[PDB]
Design a binder for this molecule. Sequence first.
Ligand SMILES: C[C@@H]1O[C@@H](O[C@H]2C[C@@H](O)[C@]3(CO)[C@H]4[C@H](O)C[C@]5(C)[C@@H](C6=CC(=O)OC6)CC[C@]5(O)[C@@H]4CC[C@]3(O)C2)[C@H](O)[C@H](O)[C@H]1O
Ligand SMILES: *[C@@H]1O[C@H](CO)[C@@H](O[C@@H]2O[C@H](CO)[C@@H](O)[C@H](O)[C@H]2NC(C)=O)[C@H](O)[C@H]1NC(C)=O
Ligand SMILES: *[C@@H]1O[C@H](CO)[C@@H](O[C@@H]2O[C@H](CO)[C@@H](O)[C@H](O)[C@H]2NC(C)=O)[C@H](O)[C@H]1NC(C)=O
Ligand SMILES: CC(C)CCC[C@@H](C)[C@H]1CC[C@H]2[C@@H]3CC=C4C[C@@H](O)CC[C@]4(C)[C@H]3CC[C@]12C
Ligand SMILES: CC(C)CCC[C@@H](C)[C@H]1CC[C@H]2[C@@H]3CC=C4C[C@@H](O)CC[C@]4(C)[C@H]3CC[C@]12C
Ligand SMILES: *[C@@H]1O[C@H](CO)[C@@H](O)[C@H](O)[C@H]1NC(C)=O
Ligand SMILES: [Mg+2]
Ligand SMILES: [Mg+2]
Ligand code: NA
Lengths: 996, 32, 291
Amino acid sequence: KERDMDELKKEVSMDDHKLSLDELHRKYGTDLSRGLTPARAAEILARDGPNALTPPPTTPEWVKFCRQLFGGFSMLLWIGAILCFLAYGIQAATEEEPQNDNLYLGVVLSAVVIITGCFSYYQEAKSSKIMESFKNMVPQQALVIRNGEKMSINAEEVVVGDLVEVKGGDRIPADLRIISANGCKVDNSSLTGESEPQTRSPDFTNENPLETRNIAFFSTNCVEGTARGIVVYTGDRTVMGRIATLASGLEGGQTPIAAEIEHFIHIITGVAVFLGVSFFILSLILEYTWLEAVIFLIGIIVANVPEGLLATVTVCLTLTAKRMARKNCLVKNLEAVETLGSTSTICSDKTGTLTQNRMTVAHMWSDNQIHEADTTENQSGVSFDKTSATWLALSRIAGLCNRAVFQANQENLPILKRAVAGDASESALLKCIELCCGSVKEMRERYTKIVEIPFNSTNKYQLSIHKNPNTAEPRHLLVMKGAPERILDRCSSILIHGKEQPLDEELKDAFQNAYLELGGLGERVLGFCHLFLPDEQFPEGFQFDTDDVNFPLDNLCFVGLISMIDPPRAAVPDAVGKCRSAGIKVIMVTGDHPITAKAIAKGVGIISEGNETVEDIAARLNIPVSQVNPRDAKACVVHGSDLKDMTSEQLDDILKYHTEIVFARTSPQQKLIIVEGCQRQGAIVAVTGDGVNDSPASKKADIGVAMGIAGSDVSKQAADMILLDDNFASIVTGVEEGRLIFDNLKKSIAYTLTSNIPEITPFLIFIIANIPLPLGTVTILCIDLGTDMVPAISLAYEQAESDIMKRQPRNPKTDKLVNEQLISMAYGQIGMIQALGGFFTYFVILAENGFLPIHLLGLRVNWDDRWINDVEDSYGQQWTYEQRKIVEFTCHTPFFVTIVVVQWADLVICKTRRNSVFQQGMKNKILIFGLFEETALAAFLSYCPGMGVALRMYPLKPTWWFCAFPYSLLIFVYDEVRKLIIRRRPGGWVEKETYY
Amino acid sequence: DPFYYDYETVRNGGLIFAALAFIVGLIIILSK
Amino acid sequence: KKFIWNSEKKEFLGRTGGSWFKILLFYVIFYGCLAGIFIGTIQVMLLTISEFKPTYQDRVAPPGLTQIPQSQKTEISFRPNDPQSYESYVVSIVRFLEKYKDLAQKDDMIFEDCGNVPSELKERGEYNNERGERKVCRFRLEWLGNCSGLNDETYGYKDGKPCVIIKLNRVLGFKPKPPKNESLETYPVMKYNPYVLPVHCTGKRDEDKEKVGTMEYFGLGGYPGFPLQYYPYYGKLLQPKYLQPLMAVQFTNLTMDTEIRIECKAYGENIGYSEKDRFQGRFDVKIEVKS
Ligand SMILES: C[C@@H]1O[C@@H](O[C@H]2C[C@@H](O)[C@]3(CO)[C@H]4[C@H](O)C[C@]5(C)[C@@H](C6=CC(=O)OC6)CC[C@]5(O)[C@@H]4CC[C@]3(O)C2)[C@H](O)[C@H](O)[C@H]1O
Ligand SMILES: *[C@@H]1O[C@H](CO)[C@@H](O[C@@H]2O[C@H](CO)[C@@H](O)[C@H](O)[C@H]2NC(C)=O)[C@H](O)[C@H]1NC(C)=O
Ligand SMILES: *[C@@H]1O[C@H](CO)[C@@H](O[C@@H]2O[C@H](CO)[C@@H](O)[C@H](O)[C@H]2NC(C)=O)[C@H](O)[C@H]1NC(C)=O
Ligand SMILES: CC(C)CCC[C@@H](C)[C@H]1CC[C@H]2[C@@H]3CC=C4C[C@@H](O)CC[C@]4(C)[C@H]3CC[C@]12C
Ligand SMILES: CC(C)CCC[C@@H](C)[C@H]1CC[C@H]2[C@@H]3CC=C4C[C@@H](O)CC[C@]4(C)[C@H]3CC[C@]12C
Ligand SMILES: *[C@@H]1O[C@H](CO)[C@@H](O)[C@H](O)[C@H]1NC(C)=O
Ligand SMILES: [Mg+2]
Ligand SMILES: [Mg+2]
Ligand code: NA
């Protein structure tokens, strides 16, 4: 009955916050100033559970090891092993002196599956282990008032309905219902994505529990001020608790690479059983009994199973994941390394993902001129002009009149990433002055503060008077900051290049348009002013006690505005541009306010400059918004309030007719609804986030990307990829590698799928032509799992043939990893030539040793007989059993060598899919070593002492090594002219039939 | 007699070829 | 998704008609060229070998030693009474000796009377085709006494005390070289050491050697071996209807209703052996005359 449990969790939360203090205390039974008796607290603590989310579902290690032992590819190898032992049982119980070929082959296939499982499991376990080294869960004790006394207890010992007090810096324990605040501002960034610190007031403001100010939330941090509140929700019943529990209980889906491997097996077994059944009927039509034909059916089907392609594909994925871990972009799931490239719609988060989630001084005003400050996370941008007197005055106004200071350990840390104590706005100002104006320590103590005035509840103004240390004037320096509408009413002089001027409207209106420019840009602006107090009316001994009008409120000297906002990360805009260049639809999904979301969207690239929303056109024409046709608006902003009243068809139309979309004020549950709406179109989705609100969105997405440090633990676990460096450019690297390894997997698969024809054709014509067996089983093992392993592994290291970040994302319904152009190449054209070359070396060995090829027909009847030791060749000679068997095995060895010789050309042509081998170039050192080791190993297997005894591989007469050269050269020339016609004629024949 | 083949020399040459090609390939993947 | 068979916009089994013809025509031309290339190279390969001699002859260095009753497991188990029990043996013996009858060797243009006494090797020039079709020395069944007879169409052989003739693997240009007069313990054997390849049979262990009481050998002129006057072989092309030497072996005193192992080892310098091939040089048999 878990369906209903999950459905009641996909719904946005309800509440009872809108209640009078008396109704609240009556419903919960708690003293508003004394809380409750500790006995009542323990009575609830041992009644519903400690205030902590239920731990995640533990995943025992034998479960995921058994998981790696199964799947889709390893399962095909499992059914192959099963068929091997079934065929071996039949051959054992039915005929005399049965052979151990099928049994050794079955145990080899089982070993292949087990070893691949061990390696893949070791890799995924390594990812999870290095992930556990990031859980630095430090216990945090809450300040709870019970029985009339203040006590600090563990966060888990907190219960429902008890007074809890929070101080600026402390973390909100459970979901509180504020009862009394004192200029308290909390941080709803990790939960609701609200960037700027939202204040918390005891009065109910909004019907939505998330938007209202009478509710503090689990895992949120009280930035500044102090407050009180009654715990309404505790443990898993909390807001972030319901979000996390929803995240864990969601579906992961099927990755695109997995679906490609599955369809790949569909074609592999399709032709395998087609050949097996058609040859089963063919063998029965010839002469062989049901006993023999059944063994033929199993032999042909099992032979068409790429035994080593499993290890090669696993190593391929592991290599690309290694490169991902090199750039601090760790992937938890191995196949997740491919999903970024196949993505075609990225749903991103604003606060903490698209942005730095930190207030930063954006722009400044001076000399009626806008000066943009560097807002990069690492300070690698343009520096404004810092040589004017207006700046030397404005910088002192900000550095002095501000309740912001660095803490104790803030020494070795950089100027930006270091922690600042106080308001977020004051923190941004302190960092900007400490960065572009030397230091604020000696600059603040240089002007001894006399009397200050903090921020006011109404007409919010902050002023302070300081002594003047200049060596030319002893007049007192008074400074004040505040909202521009509060400072314009208290200003008459204006600073410019060092001198003063009146409040002429020619420049005052120029100040107003600048205020609306920085304000309309989604930023928060503040005004800074100062004035020289006359030391004749206020001498150096006079003390201006903060009571009456000791300072002139008006007639001040305005220096300039200072705006601020959370800026996007450094490589965020360029990365968004790269994704759009690759044809990836970028859609912003955030719960922040739309006025800021739209500005950041235009600032990073989600909304292209010039494109207009449905509201922008109505504003440019001064007409109602209900008149403009939505088709004339490319981009669109969708509010969460409006999103709640939407159907499936409406959301489908929103994504189909609008190319640049921004979802604002959307709840985490709505984020999940949006991700599902994107998946309904049939496109691969990647969700990039950091907060707990991104957990249900990262989980249901085809691939989730969590920020390694600025992210929450729940969204980090429910994700499929972690960015340990928080460099958003890693998404671009990922989408590039996902396409790169996709193409390389295609090349390597065509390589392993090419050798199947010369591996099976000997047995096929052995059944038809009744000739001695041309190729042996152990030799086939030496090819599939011996020589070919290094070349196929090296085929992963191939680079881009053209610009992959230029082509559009692959269509999942069209660009399959293994299409009929690969089957037409490997099974149809290259493997065919390789099989003919093998048979050529075969006939050479037998015709040179006395058995002319024409004489080999119908010879296997007496050839395989173990007692007819007088088998006439073409010259009338009599061959014993072991003598001719020595020739057959010393005929299997050059067939294997022939395979290596033709694999040289097949590897060189498979290395390039469209380019020429000279255009691309043999720059792949792993491939060079692949050919050297492949040939050296093939030679070693034939000339090592005792191989005709152990592996029954006998030494070769050197001329055998040259019987396969013309076939390899032919393979290379054919594929080269193939890629030449593909280049010169990109229309359709060579491209739509062979180019795979 | 034509009923004899110097298999030891061919075998020895093949083993030397296998040794040299492998050490050369190792030098190839060790570009220094 | 698996009913892509057809549509009103044409497709059959997956593609259209005009596409099926293009692919089929391409595959026919492609595979045709592949066939022609394989045939041309296989022809060059045929041009690298001659008609009178195999290029590599080292894989048949030690000639084999076969017998007439090609048993399923080199075992001779039958009943001295039931004629159908030993039918499979006699049938193969008569068919084998069907080409050795006096009527089969009647043409004097391809047959040459070697002699009643084993003589030295007979080299008929070189192996080229400059000379005509060489002659093949005759070998009448009378040479194998007590294992030939003048029977009718069916050679009534030995029911009790059976016969098992041995044959040396026909090898082109092979010149048998019997051991020197310094014979390193080759059991009882006649003094006709220089012009006949000796072949001596025996048991396999202390048990088999005791069960097998007496053995009687039959050959050319009464010698247990192969005469050198019938070697070397000049291939089937130059010497068709060639009759390699034969030598019979009869086991008179056997222990009826008992399976005993016999090892007929052919001796000589040019005769090698093999611990892996029990037929190279030597020869094994499991006789059991169960009554
Ligand atoms: C008609 C039949 O022919 C001979 O046997 C034949 C059947 C069976 O015995 C085997 C050994 O088991 C088969 C086996 O089945 C399937 C294979 C493992 C197969 C695969 C390669 C691969 O990669 O996957 C599958 C290709 C051929 C194969 O390698 C061997 C080759 C030796 C052979 O011996 C051949 C004997 O002479 C027998 O006595 C006589 O009855
Ligand atoms: C071939 O078989 C005949 C039997 O038909 C053997 O002839 C006997 O020989 C012994 C001497 O060994 C005489 O005592 C008998 O009187 C003979 N019997 C007959 C009916 O002739 C003959 O010895 C056998 N030949 C060989 C070489 O063993
Ligand atoms: C043939 O073999 C038989 C054994 O089957 C020999 O005769 C036996 O001799 C032993 C004494 O050594 C006696 O105990 C048996 O009773 C005898 N059996 C028979 C059936 O006579 C016989 O000597 C052998 N003959 C030859 C010529 O080798
Ligand atoms: C396409 C070209 C560049 C490949 C270059 C490598 C070629 C020339 C190498 C690869 C394997 C080599 C063979 C390896 C094994 C044997 C057996 C040895 O006892 C004699 C040499 C001989 C017969 C070699 C001849 C040269 C050979 C065919
Ligand atoms: C005209 C050109 C392009 C044709 C290219 C293929 C040529 C080079 C191929 C075709 C047939 C080949 C021959 C096939 C048969 C033999 C016997 C073998 O035991 C040694 C190699 C040898 C001697 C080959 C040498 C190379 C060869 C002549
Ligand atoms: C072998 O030696 C014996 C005597 O030991 C002799 O009678 C015989 O003629 C010799 N044969 C040859 C070929 O030398
Ligand atoms: Mg966030
Ligand atoms: Mg294979
Ligand atoms: Na997932």
